[PDB]
Write a protein that binds this ligand. Structure first.
Ligand SMILES: O=C(CO)[C@@H](O)[C@H](O)[C@H](O)CO
Ligand SMILES: O=C(CO)[C@@H](O)[C@H](O)[C@H](O)CO
Ligand SMILES: [Mn+2]
Ligand SMILES: [Mn+2]
Lengths: 286, 290
């Protein structure tokens, strides 16, 4: 079975903090709460680094919910033809699920099905088969802990496995798990999709998670994304799931994410101004 | 001085051919000619590969003009803190210029100012200064051969040096050469620009070259690019320069370029259909009285 989802608006941690130190965690949770988000999305690329007790304390202090996203790396790539590397991926994904479970969360999303970043060539049948089997194992592990997994479709420079919602849905057909969902991100859609509606309408109840990012990943409404068409499509399918505002500036750097995402430019410096305008922007389109 | 530019529409070689063998050169030049393009843009990532005499004969046979684009690689990266790698870059750029000159061409464009692809971190002041100095030396070499150079602004995953038109213009001011121009590409703009007009309007006469690519680099008008604003901008600055249709499908693969551009998807397989529809699309928006 799937676990409950609700329409709720979140902020990604990199809007506020490049780390999850006591100070970094507080800055991000306080920032999301101040802006009036329902949840913070924690970037769990190293799930062993996060102090669960400290994080639970901060979420209670600020009356805030948490979901988690991550990308794997070459060392943890579940697409790998090296079985030791796939096993390191399974291990990281189980640890991320355990952290989310300890925080009382219900959603593990993002690039959980491969290494986030540049592949040297196209995926083989083996790469894909390895990824599908890894997401079956992860879905089954998460199901015991009341957690849905949401497979984020990202652009060609960030994966060779799935670059469109339609490809994502075909992948999910092969996974065939009730608690495995599609995750769409307007920034990635802006590059790869034939308009901003087709993949949402095709996905229907299988769309489990949404990222809102401008074309340049900066202030919403200052770039090229057709948000009107995207939000109309969400209304058509009566979408009732997480919507995270996601934005990257050289102002706030995570050394293990920011260089992978090639965030060379400062698109903003005022985290509170950006987040506050992002939430208002999203609520207006709902 | 700058060298003459004209409003002309071209097709990128990779629409037809992944190499420049006799058969490959003919397929691309015949293809560009059959679609009704004014010129072919030859990908010179390895300028020592080109049979110049064969290519000159083909361009004459089909009454077609040629421009050239390229990207450097790690071994030829003019941003490098290794002077030996910068020297290899200078040498490749000179050879590309020599090929274009022999073919009677006037435009060397694309990612001529760094290695095309993913950088592991942001560019240092030294990376940028090395690139600027290299583009000055290239501009001066090209100027003796009647050639303009056009620095192609590309997205964050393909360079760390310049990702917007506005960044391109500041870099170009540091180069300070009259035959050096900004080169904008709607595919890259779709990621990095605040709308499709700002950089064009800011560039004015400094815009020397244009690439037309859909958001996904497939059929024009099947993606997300606001071409209406882009072409409105070109009209407002009375743009008079090359406009190349550029498209990448796994159907046609240059091993030197296709994997760097992460072309994982086949968005087309009929070169003539893609190129014919692209020319129609571009012509309509150039004459579009709006
Ligand atoms: O869109 C992206 C990456 O481009 C993020 O959503 C990614 O999944 C990362 O894991 C965030 O933590
Ligand atoms: O836009 C691009 C690369 O994404 C091409 O135009 C590139 O500059 C190269 O010069 C092609 O040969
Ligand atoms: Mn995202
Ligand atoms: Mn281009």
């Amino acid at each position: 079975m799937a676990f409950p989802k609700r329409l709720e608006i979140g902020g990604h941690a990199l809007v506020w903090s490049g780390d999850w130190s006591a100070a970094g965690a507080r800055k991000a949770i306080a920032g999301a709460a101040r802006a009036g988000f329902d949840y913070i999305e924690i970037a769990l690329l190293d799930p062993w680094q996060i102090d669960v007790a400290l994080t639970k304390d901060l979420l209670q202090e600020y009356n805030l919910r948490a979901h988690a996203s991550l990308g794997l790396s070459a060392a943890t790539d579940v697409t790998s033809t090296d079985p030791a590397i796939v096993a390191k991926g399974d291990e990281l994904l189980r640890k991320a699920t355990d952290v989310l479970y300890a925080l009382g969360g219900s959603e593990l999303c993002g690039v959980i099905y491969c290494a986030l970043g540049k592949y040297p060539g196209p995926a083989s049948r083996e790469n894909r088969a390895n990824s599908v089997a890894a997401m079956q194992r992860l879905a089954d592990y998460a199901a015991d802990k009341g957690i849905n997994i949401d497979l984020e479709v990202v652009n060609r420079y960030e994966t060779n496995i799935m670059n469109t919602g339609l490809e994502g849905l075909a992948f999910l057909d092969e996974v065939n798990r009730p608690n495995a969902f599609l995750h769409l991100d307007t920034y990635h859609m802006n590059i790869e999709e034939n308009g901003m509606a087709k993949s949402v309408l095709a996905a229907g109840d299988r769309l489990g998670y949404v990222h809102i990012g401008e074309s340049h990943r900066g202030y919403l409404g200052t770039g090229n994304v057709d948000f009107a068409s995207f939000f109309a499509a969400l209304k058509q399918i009566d979408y009732r799931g997480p919507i995270t505002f996601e934005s990257f500036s050289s102002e706030i750097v995570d050394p293990k994410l920011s260089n992978t995402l090639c965030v060379w430019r400062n698109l903003w410096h005022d985290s509170d101004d950006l987040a506050g305008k992002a939430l208002e922007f999203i609520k207006q389109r709902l």
